[PDB]
């Protein structure tokens, strides 16, 4: 899969931070490729398992946490220390009662140091496609929704008010003619009483 830049900050050199552009192939122990750069020189390392996979099989492979350890080890956390000269990336794992080592990433270097940088510029392009323009897309979406909601809420106000006014006027006329009927029946009852 495509070499995606996972920027990492070395504890040895946090100033010029590194970029573990790791193209992990479906695993981190049976085939993966890591292209590490500090943003200046690209150690594009088509690495194999002949340099790290033995780290598994030589140092007490117990039964607690290994996949997550190596996964967080490729992001910005342990004492990430990539050796510029030897093209080798290492770091120390810290935990209870013992501090093991985890990664022996011997990340080879290609002659082109701008490969990861030009890939990071394609990355500035799509990352640039990460907030406002498709904001504008889903925003014409929510704006047609907003106009629909505004029009339907206006007509909701209108229909509720029209229902209220209709009930009010019907009840007004009913009250008037009912007072007519009640006065008539009361007067007729009084005439009944007189007779």
């Amino acid at each position: 899969m495509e070499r995606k830049i996972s920027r990492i900050h070395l504890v040895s050199e946090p100033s010029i931070t590194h970029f573990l552009q790791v193209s992990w192939e479906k695993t981190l122990e049976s085939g993966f490729v890591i292209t590490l750069t500090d943003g200046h020189s690209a150690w594009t390392g088509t690495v194999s398992e002949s340099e790290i996979s033995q780290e598994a099989d030589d140092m007490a492979m117990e039964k607690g946490k290994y996949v997550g350890e190596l996964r967080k080890a490729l992001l910005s956390v342990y004492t990430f220390n990539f050796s510029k000269e030897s093209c080798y990336f290492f770091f120390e794992k810290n935990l209870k009662d013992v501090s093991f080592r985890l990664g022996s990433f011997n990340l080879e270097k290609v002659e082109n140091p701008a490969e990861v940088i030009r890939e990071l510029i394609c990355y500035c392009l799509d990352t640039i496609a990460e907030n406002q323009a498709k904001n504008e897309h889903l925003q014409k979406e929510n704006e047609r929704l907003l106009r629909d909601w505004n029009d339907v809420q206006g007509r909701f106000e209108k229909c509720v008010s029209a229902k209220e006014a209709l009930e009010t006027d019907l009840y007004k006329r009913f009250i008037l003619v009912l007072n007519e009927k009640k006065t008539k029946i009361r007067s007729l009852h009084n005439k009944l009483l007189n007779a």
Binding site: Q153, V160, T168, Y171, R173, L176, V177
Partner: protein, 151 residues
């Protein structure tokens, strides 16, 4: 009016008479809503699923703030909750009042605590009813139950 003296029930005659009778708003929509509900109780018309909250005003948390007009949640359904209340005659107030027994929270229902505090302030306590209590006020075209949600 056009109504006669000795005629029994039909439908068109009242249409004609009410056309004959005046068309004036003698009373305000809230006061005449209360009178409409009064006559609904008098003639058992309050069972109509169309307007039964017409007596009591009902508070709404139609805003990001309680008992204040400082905001208005646009792009939401809160003024919609207000219209749903008003459709049955539940008069909507932005500020909690002691004449309120039903209260509907905004889209987010985290304003229950301040509602309880104002229940402590407002002696006639109001039950803390979620938005659905008033969405179904028209969705089913029928008043919902105060016991449906937090008291």
């Amino acid at each position: 009016y056009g109504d006669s003296y000795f005629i029994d029930t039909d439908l068109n005659q009242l249409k004609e008479v009410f056309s004959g009778i005046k068309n004036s708003n003698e009373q305000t929509p809230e006061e005449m809503a209360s009178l409409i509900a009064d006559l609904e109780y008098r003639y058992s018309w309050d069972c109509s699923p169309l307007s039964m909250f017409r007596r009591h005003t009902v508070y709404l948390d139609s805003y990001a703030v309680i008992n204040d007009l400082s905001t208005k949640n646009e792009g939401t359904r809160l003024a919609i909750k207000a219209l749903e209340l008003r459709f049955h005659g539940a008069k909507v107030v932005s500020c909690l009042a002691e004449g309120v027994s039903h209260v509907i929270i905004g889209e987010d229902h985290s304003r229950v605590a301040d509602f309880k505090a104002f229940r402590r302030t407002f002696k006639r306590k109001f039950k803390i009813l979620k938005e659905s209590w008033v969405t179904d006020s028209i969705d089913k075209c029928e008043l919902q139950e105060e016991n449906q949600y937090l008291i």
